[PDB]
């Protein structure tokens, strides 16, 4: 369990922080390291053992830690920092996790933040007679391109049967994405509602449907 914000952004040259929270089983008693995965390439080591900097890690990067939460800090935000950042914890000699973060996408803002417009379609009657149920969440016109999709039955979180795409760049230089929830007709008509919750830059949009 290393929950970590999907999106972090700021104007050029501004300071930024990334959080990395979990339980006590991972960093309640261990060490945390950070990694930078840039688009179209493999991850690099950024920071290891809470706050140690390699030679070719710019001094703008710095790590911190407290309780069951780690924190990476970036100063003078620039294009070279646009990438995917993961925190990691290898307390392996005993237990697992053993796990990486979520993690976070850094973005230098070229325009104001745009929260996503969400539309949720229920299963078609044509599909239900084929003994199949599929809800469709359509996420569009958001910036920066990174969202968190959480599906709900009543209020229970469901994680089984979810398929979510990675964000894609629209023609208007914004982003889009879609999430599919596979279901059985029983489960569909059993619960009084199903919801599609999208979090983005601290804000959240929610849509719901029912039989």
Q: What is the DSSP string of 1-40?
A: -EE--SEEEE-TT--EEEEEEE-TTTSTTS--EEEEE-TT
Q: Is 178 in the site for other proteins (CB under 8 A)?
A: yes
d(CA 104, CA 74): 13
Q: Is 1 in the site for other proteins (CB under 8 A)?
A: no
Q: How far apart are the first and last CA of the chain?
A: 34
Q: How far is the CB of 90 from other proteins (least distance, A)?
A: 4
Q: Is 131 in the site for other proteins (CB under 8 A)?
A: no
d(CA 194, CA 120): 10
Q: How far is the CB of 52 from other proteins (least distance, A)?
A: 10
Q: Is 29 in the site for other proteins (CB under 8 A)?
A: no
Q: Is 6 in the site for other proteins (CB under 8 A)?
A: no
Closest to other proteins by CB, 1 vs 11, is 1
Stretch near other proteins under the rule CB under 8 A, chosen from 72-80, 135-143, 183-191, 192-200: 135-143
Closest to other proteins by CB, 132 vs 189, is 132
In sequence order, what are the beta bridge partners of 66?
Answer: 69
Cα radius of gyration (the chain): 19
Q: How far is the CB of 14 from other proteins (least distance, A)?
A: 26
Residues 81-110 as x/- pattern, contact with other proteins by CB under 8 A: -----x-x-x-xx--x-xxxxxx-------
Please report, to the nearest 10 degrees, the dihedral formed by the alpha carbons of residues 75, 73, 84, 88 taken in order: 160
């Amino acid at each position: 369990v290393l929950t970590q914000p999907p999106s972090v952004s700021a104007a050029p040259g501004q300071k930024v922080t990334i959080s990395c929270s979990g339980s006590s089983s991972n960093i309640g008693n261990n060490f945390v390291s950070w990694y930078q995965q840039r688009p179209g390439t493999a991850p690099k080591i950024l920071i290891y053992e809470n706050n140690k900097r390699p030679s070719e890690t710019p001094d703008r990067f710095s790590g911190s830690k407290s309780g069951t939460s780690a924190t990476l800090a970036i100063t003078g935000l620039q294009t070279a920092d646009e990438a995917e950042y993961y925190c990691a914890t290898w307390s392996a000699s005993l237990s697992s996790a053993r796990v990486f973060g979520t993690g976070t996408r850094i973005t230098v803002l070229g325009q104001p933040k745009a929260n996503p417009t969400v539309t949720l379609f229920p299963p078609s009657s044509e599909e239900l007679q084929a003994n199949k149920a599929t809800l469709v969440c359509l996420i569009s016109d958001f910036y920066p391109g990174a969202v968190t999709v959480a599906w709900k039955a009543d209020s229970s979180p469901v994680k089984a049967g979810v398929e979510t795409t990675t964000p894609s760049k629209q023609s208007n230089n914004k982003y889009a994405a879609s999430s599919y929830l596979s279901l059985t007709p029983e489960q569909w008509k059993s619960h009084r509602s199903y919801s599609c919750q999208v979090t983005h830059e601290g804000s959240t949009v929610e849509k719901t449907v029912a039989p």
